[PDB]
Design a binder for this molecule. Structure first.
Ligand code: DGD
Ligand code: DGD
Ligand code: CLA
Ligand code: CLA
Ligand code: CLA
Ligand code: CLA
Ligand code: PHO
Ligand code: BCR
Ligand code: BCR
Ligand code: BCR
Ligand code: BCR
Ligand code: OEY
Ligand code: CL
Ligand code: CL
Ligand code: FE2
Lengths: 36, 34, 37, 62, 334, 451, 30, 82, 341
């Protein structure tokens, strides 16, 4: 009911998307879809 | 003294669970080689 | 290539140039800390 | 001394790293302003010296 | 008092039906010279060797055009980026042939329009207003600089600037897609979002304020007569509009602050159109849109076409037809 | 509660850096920490480019913007712009990045610990935005540091190794400058040249004597002005023309930066002297000209008489006249005939391209350069597919000139926008309606109807 | 190899939020 | 005002929340990973794998050409792959 | 209280996300439009309908994935799962293009539900339904582009495919085959959209730069109270500003926001109409007077003729891949090309 401070979940959440997204960019250069 | 299962509840999960599921699928895809 | 002395440092040299952008991200984490007062 | 070079180089790195974190916290925690004046002053001289030591050694290995 | 001071106080008078101002002093003659040259060239100008190849394009009404095919045609590729005032020509006849009016029109116009922008600042200063209207107009001004000035600079020729005509504009759009895959540039996708969203939010704000007008008329009269100019009060119920819109979606997807709402309306198109002007301006230096041509391939290495390969086939048809007599060598590098 | 919230400073969080307008020490901390980020990047980025560098590939095939700035200054490079010692790059790298730490340490100390306002700690460092005499003086010191800075380039070129001269014979070479140009007829004639085609204002500067001489004049000018302002206060007329406020000074500099960004964009696009194609790749014009030469050469070897070969429009297929008669390459490249480059100037005579030299004196190195430069023309996709937009994937390339010209046009534009935003606001803030129209005295209401 | 790259930036990146985290514990002057 | 649900700030800061969602999220993620790693997405939806677009020696596409014989056309094309 | 009245009380309850009767049409059709897109751009090919990849699973990125239209051989079939083409085979339905109709038809009833939803909420709150009326213009577009246009052609093949780059493909097809840019009804559409964006920007900026000073901080957002009676900016100073800058200005605030609805809503309606025409190949493609002249005078050139030559190159370079079912074989030597390129 307020036991974890919001700003922590934000940074955590934030870094979580940042990683899934980076991954999709790495994949644009590897394997399927990389023209290679 | 709120409810935990509301209409709102159903709405978020109709979207939010296929999303995570879809995302792991899309992760695994980055690793497929031709 | 770096000079061969510094080859164990290549992968840190790879990540260094992005550090400026984190200063901007860190500003926002900080205003979340203080709640945008 | 192919090894003592890097040795001092990592010391710079693990120290910069210590200092990157320590100096801001030390500066804005009101508690130990006087207990820490020492720490950063020593770290700083230690940092500078480390840069120079790595500086001179590079001209034996590169 | 002294004559220089009577004059200054007239230039800057907030009593003139139309404000002059110091930006006004440059804006007025230059827009007049562009307007008069443009009108006269559109009706009467003779054909113009746009591509420098002695193949003149007829742009004017009297040489067989209509409103929709007519244009003032860009200046010769043989001129490139050289300055070509009327006084550099051996004769008006030479100036017309090689595209001179285009230079006259766009220079006087870019200038007069830039001062238009400043004049908006100026009047807002004299009225005691906040000053940033002129910042919203910088988005369309930027866009004009891009198609008339920046893109010709990167490419080496005013001949590759946007023509001043309805069909010439389309010509320009198709050639750009072939040479720059502008549809596949994010900055243009940002501009579309800018203008689709702009129109969307226009209809919304329009429909939402209008949805909540206070009954101050009967059914036999325009509801517009329920607003009296400079009335102390507001004529719609923003609380009522919020309660409608917050329910259409959910409560916090809706604005309840008027200032925050209107700033949103200003910023959305302005930003996006900054991006697309930046889009034309950076593709002026051949930093082009994404290229996924043959990007998927199978185990063997056959190409598996995607929709981007279908886009490139269209692009290619534009490529090989455009300016069909003007290339001698295999690559079209500007 | 020391400002630092919307309720004391009058600004929200999204504009909280405006909470520092009248806190000089905390504001000093911000400028030094930021400078530390600038030096950090100069440092980080050079060592990245070094680590990824392969001396066998051209610089312009490897995504390098900073290392070519170092080669141009004459370090690390041999005849032909061939790299012959990487160590100087590494140095430039480590000094900046180390240096960034004493800046970083300095800014974070001044922004957190030190005095928030300097004007009680020492009457020399503290300042009021509105002290016309203190603001000319700070500008004066900085003017002198700038003029010193220009003189360092002079020192590098005349005393400490020279600079890369793409125009040097034998293909280009580092070289020491000993007759800087000082004639102001030359040095300021650049300034009165038209920015239009075939003139190019100061972008046309094409020899290092001219370049070095210009930095002698500007160095001495800036020192002179630095002194001027340290001893003067602004005159009656100047005080009346300007707004004297922290924000207005900021708006003037954004103007200045914006204008400079646009100039830079055009330097890297068109100038192949201080941005030599050895390092930055060919210019757009250079690439287009190169293609016409490649195919002139090829067909001339087959037996084509290239001076009389009439193409489809009636203009020469290989050669035609510009509008003032010069002999120039044909096809669409007719727009580019202002191009001047060390690989091509040898075929030039007084009337332009000389046909006996075309028939006879094309050396293999030019055929190599022309082919190299036409196949590295500054066109490619945002995801670094090289070529025209209809090209298939394969070549991973975007010219440094494209990266540099796009990035700095974008930055130039948003900084002009910043000029207007802050300039107009400074006007409003000083006249006192930046926060809105006062209902009790709405000005328009005291005016007479237009009709 | 590239895991080298990931661990460094994971550490540099975690370094920022830490300072802020440490400074709220000690009720330092944010 | 408040329709009466539990505020989101109150939930996603609550521990109970993350107790449950520490497990459920990554569980879903992996399930969707496993849905593709098993290769099962290919046969559910009919999507070719990189070795199933063409037969070894063909460069024409299996374009469906009959409205009612369409199911059959596709099946007979997946046989010419073995 | 009848059971009908009890079910009505519950649907019209004030919750976080209001439901209503409209909801019963709305949430399932919308949810399933969405999901069929997400599902098909993630996992489904267009190999048997189009000869294309189209999912993430195949290695497409966000710009090139699509739920692609059915092959031309299907006609205008509804392509029901239990229909005679796929015969209850889910997998076969995906490969034949049934996700496309699934999305199209659940989408279209989806939008219906949304418009009813604007009617239902406006009535319960008590306001004029002008927003519902404005929402007619997106419906006219979606219907005109996605349903009418293909029903007038040979099949659903030629409708738009649901995809970023696939839509770019549609755009360029419409230029090369229909000469859509020359059509008066799109021109009106263009004017309405760009005029909408204009109205949107200029009105926001006007209001933001005519605010009265009603608080004391430099953020001006915190000087507005939604229940305040007083206009937050000055209509009188805005009028004088634009009267003297532009020569005219708004004076009536109701007309000003009514005009804002009108302009973009009417642009979209006009473009819809022209597209209905294009369902029939009823194009504005040519100007007869210019072709007659052009045909007789080889020195007559205009930007209209230049553009037609471009159109011609698009048609021939793109059709063989674009409409694989026609088995178009164009030898190198018939391909139109200018010099060198
Ligand atoms: C307040 C200020 C008020 C100012 C008003 C009056 C001044 C207006 C200036 C007009 C500029 C427009 C024309 C510029 C186009 C042009 O040919 O400019 C290009 C020239 C470069 O010129 C080229 O320079 C070349 C120099 O290279 C030569 O020399 C080189 C030596 O290396 C090489 O050898 C090369 O091969 C050789 O050709 C040649 O001379 C070319 O022919 C020549 O075109 O750049 C220039 O001088 C640099 C100038 C940059 C112009 C800034 C553009 C700003 C865009 C406005 C953005 C609006 C933003 C939105 C507003 C809201
Ligand atoms: C605004 C508010 C919006 C509310 C939106 C609500 C959405 C409702 C959902 C819409 C469902 C419509 C599906 C229509 C299916 C259709 O048409 O399906 C098409 C079939 C006709 O089938 C076609 O028939 C063609 C002609 O064939 C005929 O001709 C051949 C000779 O050449 C042979 O003889 C052949 O046997 C013979 O059938 C070909 O066979 C085509 O391949 C085949 O698809 O008709 C039929 O289903 C029915 C034909 C009767 C018309 C039904 C009215 C709806 C259509 C309006 C069209 C007007 C606009 C057209 C402008 C253009
Ligand atoms: C960072 C650079 C810089 C800045 C910001 C300033 C700022 C200032 N200077 Mg200093 N100055 C500098 C460098 C600088 N100066 C240097 C290096 C010198 C040595 C040359 C001088 C010499 C100098 C003198 C001699 C004077 C100033 C004065 C002033 C003040 C008024 C400026 C003014 O009216 O602008 C310019 C505004 C104008 C309205 C000028 C109009 C003329 C046209 C429109 C501009 C073009 C002029 C340009 C020289 C020619 C065009 C070149 C073209 C090819 C582009 C202001 C505080 C004045 C003052 O108050 O004295 C203390 C004054 O008289 N400055
Ligand atoms: C270049 C970027 C930059 C810089 C240099 C500054 C600098 C400053 N800002 Mg601004 N700000 C920025 C971006 C920037 N800001 C952005 C992007 C935002 C939007 C989110 C804001 C929002 C903002 C607000 C809302 C406020 C400021 C304030 C301040 C000042 C004091 C902040 C304070 O008390 O720290 C408190 C924070 C801490 C003690 C946490 C730790 C901070 C340090 C710096 C961590 C550094 C780590 C680093 C790696 C150090 C180790 C290396 C060393 C050995 C060299 C300071 C001068 C404040 C001000 O004006 O005060 C009156 C203020 O109220 N800023
Ligand atoms: C004006 C400054 C500038 C310029 C010209 C370049 C140019 C370049 N950089 Mg560099 N870089 C810069 C600043 C700059 N960078 C900064 C600040 C950083 C730290 C983040 C880096 C970090 C960096 C790395 C780590 C790498 C490069 C590389 C490169 C090259 C490829 C760029 C690319 O693929 O774009 C990709 C384009 C984008 C991501 C689009 C970004 C556009 C933003 C989101 C929109 C604009 C925002 C704002 C409104 C303006 C190119 C030569 C690469 C290379 O070849 O190394 C040798 C490489 O790997 N750069
Ligand atoms: C433009 C930047 C700038 C400015 C104006 C100041 C100004 C000030 N600082 Mg800060 N400071 C800075 C940068 C700056 N500092 C940096 C980078 C650091 C980290 C090294 C510090 C660390 C620091 C601390 C820790 C303290 C100050 C203090 C002070 C005050 C007195 C300093 C004094 O009297 O020096 C006297 C000046 C000299 C003895 C002259 C020598 C200075 C250097 C060596 C000259 C070298 C110039 C260099 C060669 C030029 C090239 C620069 C480089 C970018 C290439 C004053 C308000 C003190 C304070 O506020 O008191 C509480 C204090 O305790 N400063
Ligand atoms: C591309 C542009 C564009 C988009 C994406 C769009 C979207 C939207 N506008 C809405 C509203 C409006 N639009 C309006 C005016 C306009 N809208 C315009 C242009 C657009 N409008 C224009 C130009 C105008 C000017 C007249 C008004 C006046 C309103 C509203 O009142 C309303 C709102 O609340 O906006 C703030 C919303 C309707 C919500 C809804 O139906 O939920 C239900 C969703 C359903 C039924 C699913 C639809 C399925 C669609 C039709 C097909 C499938 C889509 C795929 C899943 C995704 C495909 C993606 C690829 C194509 C790339 C939605 C956000
Ligand atoms: C040089 C060097 C060094 C140093 C380094 C440095 C200097 C560091 C820094 C670092 C940093 C400086 C970092 C930072 C980080 C940051 C981060 C990581 C952030 C993030 C963020 C986020 C994600 C957020 C989120 C959010 C919020 C909070 C709110 C709003 C919303 C959002 C979502 C946005 C060393 C020692 C290593 C050694 C080597 C060399
Ligand atoms: C104030 C503030 C801010 C800002 C901050 C800043 C901006 C900072 C800066 C800082 C900095 C800017 C720092 C720097 C650092 C550095 C360092 C730490 C370095 C070190 C170095 C080293 C360690 C090196 C090593 C080496 C060598 C020598 C060689 C090669 C290898 C190597 C790399 C390893 C913010 C916004 C956040 C918030 C609010 C407040
Ligand atoms: C290094 C070099 C060089 C040299 C350079 C020089 C020598 C330069 C000069 C520079 C300068 C010589 C510049 C100047 C500038 C100017 C300006 C930019 C102006 C400004 C003005 C204004 C902006 C104004 C404003 C106003 C008005 C008009 C009215 C009243 C108000 C006011 C005040 C606002 C050369 C090229 C040879 C070569 C290479 C390198
Ligand atoms: C079809 C069908 C169906 C249905 C289905 C559905 C219902 C589905 C679902 C699905 C879903 C519902 C899905 C979901 C999706 C998700 C996703 C996949 C997302 C993603 C996203 C992202 C990736 C984003 C991110 C980002 C970015 C990118 C940038 C900015 C920021 C952010 C962070 C936002 C049924 C059963 C009837 C059966 C029949 C068929
Ligand atoms: O696109 Mn194609 O590229 Ca720019 O130039 Mn070369 O050809 Mn020509 O004159 Mn107008 O257009
Ligand atoms: Cl053309
Ligand atoms: Cl050519
Ligand atoms: Fe409004």
């Amino acid at each position: 009911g307020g036991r974890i401070p919001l700003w922590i979940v934000a940074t955590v959440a934030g870094m979580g998307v940042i990683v899934i997204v980076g991954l999709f960019f790495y994949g644009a250069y590897a394997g399927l879809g990389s023209s290679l | 003294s709120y409810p935990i299962f509301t209409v709102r509840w159903v709405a978020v999960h109709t979207l939010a669970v296929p999303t995570i599921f879809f995302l792991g699928a899309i992760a695994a895809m980055q690793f497929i080689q031709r | 290539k770096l000079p061969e002395a510094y080859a164990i440092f290549d992968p840190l040299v790879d990540v260094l140039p992005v550090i400026p952008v984190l200063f901007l991200a860190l500003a926002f984490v900080w205003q979340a800390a203080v709640g945008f007062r | 001394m192919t090894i003592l070079f890097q040795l001092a180089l990592a010391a710079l790195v693990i120290l910069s790293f210590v200092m990157v974190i320590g100096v801001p916290v030390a500066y804005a925690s009101p508690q130990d302003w006087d207990r820490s004046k020492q720490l950063i002053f020593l770290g700083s001289g230690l940092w500078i010296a480390l840069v120079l030591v790595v500086g001179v050694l590079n001209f034996f290995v590169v | 008092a002294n004559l220089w001071e009577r004059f200054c106080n007239w230039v800057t008078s907030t009593d003139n039906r139309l404000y002059v101002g110091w930006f006004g002093v440059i804006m007025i003659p230059t827009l007049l010279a562009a307007t008069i040259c443009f009108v006269i060239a559109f009706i009467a100008a003779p054909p113009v060797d746009i591509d420098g190849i002695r193949e003149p394009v007829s742009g004017s009404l009297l040489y067989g055009n209509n409103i929709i095919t007519g244009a003032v045609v860009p200046s010769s590729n043989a001129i490139g980026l050289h300055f070509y005032p009327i006084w550099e020509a051996a004769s008006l006849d030479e100036w017309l042939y090689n595209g001179g009016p285009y230079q006259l029109i766009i220079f006087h116009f870019l200038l007069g329009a830039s001062c238009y922008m400043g004049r908006q600042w100026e009047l807002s200063y004299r009225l005691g207003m906040r000053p940033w209207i002129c910042v919203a107009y910088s988005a369309p001004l930027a866009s004009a600089f891009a198609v008339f000035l920046i893109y010709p600079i990167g490419q080496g020729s005013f001949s590759d600037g946007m023509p001043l005509g309805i069909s010439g504009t389309f010509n320009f759009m198709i050639v750009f897609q072939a040479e720059h895959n502008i549809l596949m540039h994010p900055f243009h996708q940002l501009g579309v979002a800018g203008v689709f969203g702009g129109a969307l939010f226009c209809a919304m704000h329009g429909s939402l304020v209008t949805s909540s007008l206070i009954r101050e008329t009967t059914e036999t009269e325009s509801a517009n007569y329920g607003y009296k100019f400079g009335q102390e009060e507001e004529t719609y119920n923003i609380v009522a509009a919020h309660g409608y819109f917050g329910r259409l979606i959910f409560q916090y997807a809706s604005f309840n602050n008027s200032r925050s709402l209107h700033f949103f309306l200003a910023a959305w198109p302005v930003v996006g159109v900054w991006f697309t002007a930046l889009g034309i301006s950076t593709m002026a230096f051949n930093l082009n849109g994404f290229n996924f041509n043959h990007s998927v391939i199978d185990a063997k290495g056959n190409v598996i076409n995607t929709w981007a390969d279908i886009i490139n086939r269209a692009n290619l048809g534009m490529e090989v037809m455009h300016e069909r007599n003007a290339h001698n060598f295999p690559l079209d590098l500007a | 509660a020391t400002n630092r919230d919307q309720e004391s400073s009058g600004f929200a969080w999204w504009a909280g850096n405006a909470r520092l307008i009248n806190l000089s020490g905390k504001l000093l901390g911000a400028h030094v920490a930021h400078a530390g980020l600038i030096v950090f990047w100069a440092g980080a980025m050079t060592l990245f480019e070094l680590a990824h560098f392969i001396p066998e590939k051209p610089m312009y095939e490897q995504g390098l913007i900073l290392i070519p700035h170092i080669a141009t200054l004459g370090w690390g490079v041999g005849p032909g712009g061939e790299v012959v010692d990487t160590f100087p790059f590494f140095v430039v790298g480590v000094v900046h990045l180390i240096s960034s730490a004493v800046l970083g340490f300095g800014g974070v100390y001044h922004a957190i610990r030190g005095p928030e306002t300097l004007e009680e700690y020492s009457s020399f460092f503290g300042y009021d935005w509105k002290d016309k005499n203190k603001m000319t003086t700070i500008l004066g010191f900085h003017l002198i540091v700038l003029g010193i800075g220009a003189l360092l380039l002079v020192a590098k070129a005349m005393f400490f190794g020279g600079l890369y001269d793409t125009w040097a014979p034998g293909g280009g070479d580092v070289r020491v400058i000993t007759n800087p140009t000082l004639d102001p007829r030359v040095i300021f004639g650049y300034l009165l040249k038209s920015p239009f085609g075939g003139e190019g204002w100061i972008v046309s500067v094409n020899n290092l004597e001219d370049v070095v001489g210009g930095h002698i004049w500007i160095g001495l000018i800036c020192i002179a002005g630095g002194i001027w302002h340290i001893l003067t206060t602004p005159f009656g007329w100047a005080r009346r023309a300007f707004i004297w406020s922290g924000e207005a000074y900021l708006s003037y500099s954004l103007g200045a930066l914006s204008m400079m960004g646009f100039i830079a964009t055009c330097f890297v696009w068109f100038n192949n002297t201080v941005y030599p194609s050895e390092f930055y790749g060919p210019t757009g014009p250079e690439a287009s000209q190169a293609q016409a030469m490649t195919f002139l050469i090829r067909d001339q070897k087959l037996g084509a008489n290239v001076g009389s070969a009439q193409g489809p429009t009636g203009l020469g297929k290989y050669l035609m006249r510009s509008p003032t008669g010069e002999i120039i390459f044909g096809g669409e490249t007719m727009r580019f005939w202002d191009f001047r480059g060390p690989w091509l100037e040898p075929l030039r005579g007084p009337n332009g391209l000389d046909l006996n030299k075309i028939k006879n004196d094309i050396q293999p190195w030019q055929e190599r350069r022309a082919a190299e430069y036409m196949t590295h023309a500054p066109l490619g996709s945002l995801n670094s597919v090289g070529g025209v937009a209809t090209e298939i994937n394969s070549v991973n390339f975007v010219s440094p000139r494209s990266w540099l010209a796009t990035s700095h046009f974008v930055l130039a534009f948003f900084f002009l926008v910043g000029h207007l935003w802050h300039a107009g606001r400074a006007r409003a803030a000083a006249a006192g309606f930046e926060k809105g129209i006062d209902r009790e005295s709405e000005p328009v209401l005291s005016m007479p109807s237009l009709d | 190899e590239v895991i080298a790259q990931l661990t460094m930036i994971a550490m540099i990146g975690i370094a920022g939020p830490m300072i802020i985290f440490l400074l709220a514990v000690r009720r330092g002057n944010l | 005002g408040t329709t009466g649900e539990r505020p989101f700030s109150d939930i996603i800061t609550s521990v109970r929340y993350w107790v449950i969602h520490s497990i459920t999220i990554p569980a879903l993620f992996i399930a969707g990973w496993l849905f593709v790693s098993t290769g099962l997405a290919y046969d559910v939806f009919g999507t070719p794998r990189p070795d199933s677009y063409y037969a070894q020696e063909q460069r024409s596409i299996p374009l469906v050409t009959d409205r009612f014989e369409a199911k059959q056309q596709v099946e007979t094309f997946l046989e010419q792959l073995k | 209280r009848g059971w009908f009245d009890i079910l009505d009380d519950w649907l019209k309850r004030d919750r976080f996300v209001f439901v209503g009767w409209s909801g019963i049409l709305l949430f399932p059709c919308a949810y399933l439009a969405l999901g069929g897109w997400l599902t098909g751009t993630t996992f489904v090919t267009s190999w048997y309908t189009h000869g294309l990849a189209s999912s993430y699973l195949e290695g497409c990125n966000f710009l090139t994935v699509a739920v692609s239209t059915p092959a031309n051989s299907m006609g205008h079939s509804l392509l029901l799962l239990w229909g005679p083409e796929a015969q209850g085979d889910f997998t076969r339905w995906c490969q034949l293009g049934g996700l496309w109709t699934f999305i199209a038809l659940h989408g279209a009833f989806g939008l219906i539900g949304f418009m009813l939803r604007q009617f239902e909420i406006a009535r319960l709150v008590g306001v004029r339904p002008y927003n519902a009326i404005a929402f007619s213009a997106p419906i006219a577009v979606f219907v005109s582009v996605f349903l009418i246009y293909p029903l007038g052609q040979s099949s659903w093949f030629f409708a738009p495919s649901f995809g970023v780059a696939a839509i770019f493909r549609f755009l360029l097809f419409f230029q090369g085959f229909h000469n859509w840019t020359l059509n008066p009804f799109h021109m009106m559409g263009v004017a309405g959209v760009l005029g909408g964006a204009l109205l949107c920007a200029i009105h926001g900026a006007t209001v933001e730069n005519t605010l009265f000073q009603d608080g004391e901080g430099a953020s001006t957002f915190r000087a507005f109270n939604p229940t305040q009676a007083e206009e937050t900016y000055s209509m009188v100073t805005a009028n004088r500003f634009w009267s003297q800058i532009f020569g005219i200005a708004f004076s009536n605030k109701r007309w000003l926001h009514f005009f804002m609805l009108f302009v973009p809503v009417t642009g979209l309606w006009m473009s819809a109409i022209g597209v209905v025409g294009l369902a029939l190949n009823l194009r504005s493609y040519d100007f007869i007077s210019q072709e007659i002249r052009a045909a007789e005078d080889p020195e007559f050139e205009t930007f209209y003729t230049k553009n037609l030559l471009l159109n011609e190159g698009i048609r021939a370079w793109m059709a063989p891949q674009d409409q694989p079912h026609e088995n178009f074989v164009f030898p190198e030597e018939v391909l139109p090309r200018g010099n060198a390129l």
